[PDB]
Nucleic acid binder design. Structure first.
Lengths: 139, 169, 127, 129, 52, 149
RNA sequence: GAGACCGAUAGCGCACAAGUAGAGUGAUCGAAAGAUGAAAAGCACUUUGAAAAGAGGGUUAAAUAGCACGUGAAAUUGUUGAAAGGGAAGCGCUUGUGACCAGACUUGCGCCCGGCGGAUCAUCCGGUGUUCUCACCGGUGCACUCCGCCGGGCUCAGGCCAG
RNA sequence: GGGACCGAGGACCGCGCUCUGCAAGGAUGCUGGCGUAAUGGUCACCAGCGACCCGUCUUGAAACACGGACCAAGGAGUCAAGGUUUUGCGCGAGUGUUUGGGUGUAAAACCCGCACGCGUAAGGUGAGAGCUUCGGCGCAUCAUCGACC
RNA sequence: CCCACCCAUACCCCGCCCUCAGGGUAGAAACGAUGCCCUGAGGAGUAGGCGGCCGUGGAGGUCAGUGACGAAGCCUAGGGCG
């Protein structure tokens, strides 16, 4: 055929609607992007097999592409919400990423993304009071 | 608006004049003479300048200016009698004194905390000169403002251990 | 978390700027660097005791480039959607809220960043 | 040259494929094909059906004809023999005339699948002058 | 005013570009990369019945 | 420098100052050095000079690159076809001038020596027999090599 | 009717009582010059001053917008604050003094006990989704299993300058 | 034996040796004070050493000469036609819709009937890239003998 | 004539920057491949040639971008990056 993941990367490497470019690096807003970095490894929309993790009310919501439904967006994402313990969520996500040959390279990235979301859902410690110094302290 | 914005207007009295048709250089020197003085002392001084009893020292704008014995009080030889500048300063000091009376302050204790002379937009007048040129006679007006106010440890362990021993003995 | 990734010590070969020649003398000449194109100017010929000329020799280490002293890389942020872009980069990147972000939007950004553990460079501006 | 001057995305894929082949094989065929993908169009003159027909006259039949160029048609040739031609591009008439004779037309990526080392291949170039 | 405001483009290249644009419109990833909210629609080459 | 001595120094691989090379004595090579006398100091090295030069400042020319001689595998891969398979074979080849001196010496990148510890002399640009440093010191080059090493 | 045009030193000389003011005997030559505020609500009244104005008081979201009126740079000037100055100043490298400051840190992780508060503990059964072997829901599993908190002990990693 | 400067890299792999290991492909271990302007940074000044005022023009070079009171804004290789070289793109013995005509959501976009512009209507030997069934086959191009008009 | 000593951007060792050159990198646990890793050498520069990058006015698409809870502009002996 004429369309492949290699072609979509070539078309969309230099510019995208998901691309964020600054002096210190290039980021991506793609929902199927585990590290939010612009690369062929992590460009979810480019790849036929890709993963993405988004927060839920409690837990994580993992979405994976269905290869046999690339032309049906409404039925192209396999969505699982994990609201059990953190370790059980990591087990399923890693098995989802490596036990069948569906992006085993993203196993470590996917588990880390789930960990960050679960950590971000934890209660927040109150910050210590600010301390003035020198001239500011004496006024 | 005024430049000395650190003075609360409730405890002070102020006066202002704009586009005053007097020499800026002469007015600047005589304002500097009465800076920081008492109101009554400045008024007596400014009157004496009109009658040529006291002289205003010329510090910055004194190029090719005569010498008098009345400047010996200030430590300079070049002193002058800016009569016109003194008259304008008298009016503003009297106005600020009147504003102090309305507020209820004590005129016998007021001092000139802040006095400033700035430059105004210049006026123009053309005079006739030979060799085909018309010479300008641009005037130099000034702005004047004045305000009257009432007259009135992280020591180390060795450092701490030394101090304890010295305090015991 | 607040702590950044372990990194090599940050060295700066030169700290002071590269002042333009004769910019100290003329108000029309800004201090921004300009390469002198004259043939006899002693700055271009590199005579001793004259202003230095910027060159690639002063280039900072690749492993420490664009890192603030804390060890993070600044990422300009405009809204809450921008700080969630930093979810994977607590230890490598810091958030810098833009100068035109309103006061109430700033509180939302700082609240989200604290949840994400992302450092904010200007978190106490309008407090 | 490291990057081709062309902006064609598919040409970049061909270069990437043959850069891998040239590095991982000892075939000088792959290095020639890779270096010809990099050069300019004036350096890649067209090869006509008449020229390829001449070059397989003697014993080079039942071989694969490979040109990194565009294959054109020639009206001077009345009969076109059956042949196996792989090229960057084919004209509408040259492709039809080759297929009418009974031959097959390939692209350079199909050539990599069929002949990863350039075995049993006839590599030609167009007239530079 | 004589500045060559208009550009002459081959009709062959014009039709080539339109064909490429139509083909890219059938590619679902390229639709998202261009900013289109294509997540609740099936069959990216969305064909609606002419009767409706 | 006149054009003739310039070419000789390029042919002797003496491109920078304090560069040292090993030359086998020969009427073809003896006359070359005699023309570059106002720029070179040369003599007859001993075993210690040869040993410490290769051990401390010995780098090989491997595929056009300057690779330090830190292992015997480096020497054998480049000079094993001539029978030199270790560091001591290389030293033996240079000291006792053998059939493969040209290959061993050219393999050795020209030695980059430091300035001598103790100085050259009050006037270093006279001939050695006039109290300078230029010319043939014969067996006195060893004392110079100690200082530059 | 329009513009991938210009935006008050631009665009027609003219965005304004512009072919005007003004110059030349005349033919002709020919400028400068826009912006308070949503609304004049354009400061009543009191007081000092001959007056111009000033100060209180007031309008207003704002007078840090008072018709010398949006915003208000630099050259140049005044006052205040700090400092330097035996026939130049200014510039480069390096300390020191004085003033003034951005960071960093505030603890996290993981084990062993104890008090808890709660059944998304393992297994099995049904349904569903998928990458066809992995998951999710519901039930069983009502407590040496699992999840969060609190009180102790310990390990490790944590900033700056040094021996 | 006594000093000085430095610690680049970051799971393992190698060469080795004096092998329960090691000084062998790059610093670890133990300890103290402090945890804040203390280190560090920016300014101004003093101090030691260093340091001609820019540009233009002429000349082998200097020197002379010219421009420079200060600031803000403006300020100078552009457009068109005709040739030409190189890169990218389309079609390719053809190529060029846009004088014009036909639709149009109307100066856009889409389509094209007839002319018209530019171009077009087969050998021997030696090398030689690349194939090889190891016998050989031989691109482009050059040299030579050709053949034809 | 002899001994020691002083220091140049010069010579030796190390760190960092850039450029050049030579190698590795897919039955992909796989990549701003315009990337990453390894090794070596080099660094003055007028006329001139080549490349990258910064900045200003306007246009298309895009960031469901910023903003009266304050855009733009201007001031700053306040900081960060190059």
């Amino acid at each position: 055929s004429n369309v492949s993941a290699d072609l979509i990367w070539e078309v969309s490497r230099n510019y995208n609607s998901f691309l964020v470019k600054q002096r210190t690096g290039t980021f991506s807003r793609d929902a199927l992007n585990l590290t939010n970095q612009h690369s062929r490894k992590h460009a979810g929309f480019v790849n036929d097999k890709a993963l993405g993790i988004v927060p839920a009310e409690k837990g994580v919501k993992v979405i994976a592409k269905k290869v046999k439904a690339a032309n049906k967006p409404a039925s192209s994402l396999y969505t699982v919400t994990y609201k059990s313990t953190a370790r059980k969520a990591y087990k399923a996500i890693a098995s989802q990423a490596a036990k069948h040959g569906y992006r085993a390279d993203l196993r470590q990235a996917a588990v880390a993304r789930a960990s960050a979301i679960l950590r971000s859902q934890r209660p927040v410690k109150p910050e210590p009071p600010k301390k003035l110094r020198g001239a500011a302290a004496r006024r | 608006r005024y430049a000395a914005t650190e003075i609360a207007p409730t405890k002070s009295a102020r006066a202002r004049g704009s586009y005053l048709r007097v020499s800026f250089k002469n007015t600047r020197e005589t304002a500097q003479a009465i800076n920081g003085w008492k109101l009554q002392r400045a008024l007596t001084f400014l009157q004496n300048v009109i009658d040529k009893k006291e002289a205003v020292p010329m510090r910055r704008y004194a190029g090719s200016t005569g010498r008098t014995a009345q400047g010996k009080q200030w430590g300079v030889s070049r002193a002058r009698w800016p009569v016109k500048s003194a008259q304008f300063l008298i009016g503003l000091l009297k106005n600020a004194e009147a504003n102090a009376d309305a507020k209820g302050l004590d005129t016998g204790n007021l001092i000139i905390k802040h006095i400033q002379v700035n430059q105004a937009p210049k006026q123009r007048r053309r005079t006739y000169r030979a060799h085909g040129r018309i010479n300008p006679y641009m005037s130099n007006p000034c702005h004047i403002e004045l305000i009257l106010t009432e007259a009135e440890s992280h020591l180390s362990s060795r450092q701490r251990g030394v101090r304890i021993r010295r305090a015991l003995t | 978390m607040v702590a950044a990734k372990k990194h090599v010590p940050i060295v700066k070969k030169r700290t002071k700027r590269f002042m333009r020649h004769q910019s100290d003398r003329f108000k029309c000449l800004d201090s921004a660097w300009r390469k002198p194109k004259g043939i006899d100017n002693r700055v271009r010929r590199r005579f001793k005791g004259n202003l230095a000329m910027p060159s690639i020799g002063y280039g900072s280490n690749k492993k420490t480039k664009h890192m603030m002293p804390s060890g993070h890389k600044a990422f300009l942020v405009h809204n809450v959607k921008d700080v969630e872009l930093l979810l994977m980069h607590n230890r490598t990147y810091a958030a810098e809220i833009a100068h035109n972000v309103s006061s109430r939007k700033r509180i939302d950004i700082i609240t989200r960043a604290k949840q994400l553990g992302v450092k904010v460079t200007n978190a106490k501006a309008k407090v | 040259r490291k990057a081709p001057k062309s902006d064609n995305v598919y040409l970049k894929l061909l270069v990437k494929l043959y850069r891998f082949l040239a590095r991982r094989t000892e075939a000088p065929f792959n290095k020639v094909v890779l270096r010809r993908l990099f050069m300019s169009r004036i350096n890649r003159p067209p090869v006509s059906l008449s020229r390829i027909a001449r070059n397989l006259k003697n014993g080079n039949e039942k071989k694969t004809v490979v040109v990194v160029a565009t294959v054109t048609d020639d009206n001077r040739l009345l009969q076109v023999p059956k042949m196996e031609v792989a090229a960057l591009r084919f004209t509408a008439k040259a492709r039809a005339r080759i297929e009418a004779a009974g031959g097959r037309t390939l692209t350079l990526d199909q050539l990599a699948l069929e002949k990863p080392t350039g075995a049993n291949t006839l590599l030609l170039r167009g007239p530079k002058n | 005013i004589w500045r060559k405001w208009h550009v002459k483009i081959n009709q062959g290249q014009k039709r080539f570009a339109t064909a490429s644009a139509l083909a890219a419109s059938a590619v679902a990833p390229l639709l998202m990369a261009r900013g289109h909210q294509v997540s609740t629609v099936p069959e990216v080459p969305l064909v609606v019945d002419s009767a409706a | 420098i006149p054009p003739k001595p310039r070419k000789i120094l390029q042919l002797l691989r003496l491109r920078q100052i304090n560069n040292g090379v090993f030359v086998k004595v020969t009427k073809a090579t003896a006359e070359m050095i005699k023309i570059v006398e106002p720029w070179v100091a040369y003599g007859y090295p001993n075993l210690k000079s040869v040993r410490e030069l290769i051990y401390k400042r010995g780098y090989g020319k491997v595929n056009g690159q300057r690779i330090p001689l830190t292992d015997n595998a480096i020497i054998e891969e480049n000079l094993g076809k001539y029978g030199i398979i270790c560091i001591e074979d290389l030293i033996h080849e240079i000291f006792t001038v053998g059939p493969n001196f040209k290959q061993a010496a050219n393999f050795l990148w020209p030695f980059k020596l430091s300035n001598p510890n103790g100085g050259f002399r009050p006037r270093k640009f006279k001939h050695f027999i006039e109290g300078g440093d230029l010319g043939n010191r014969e067996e006195h080059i060893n004392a110079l090599i100690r200082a530059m090493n």
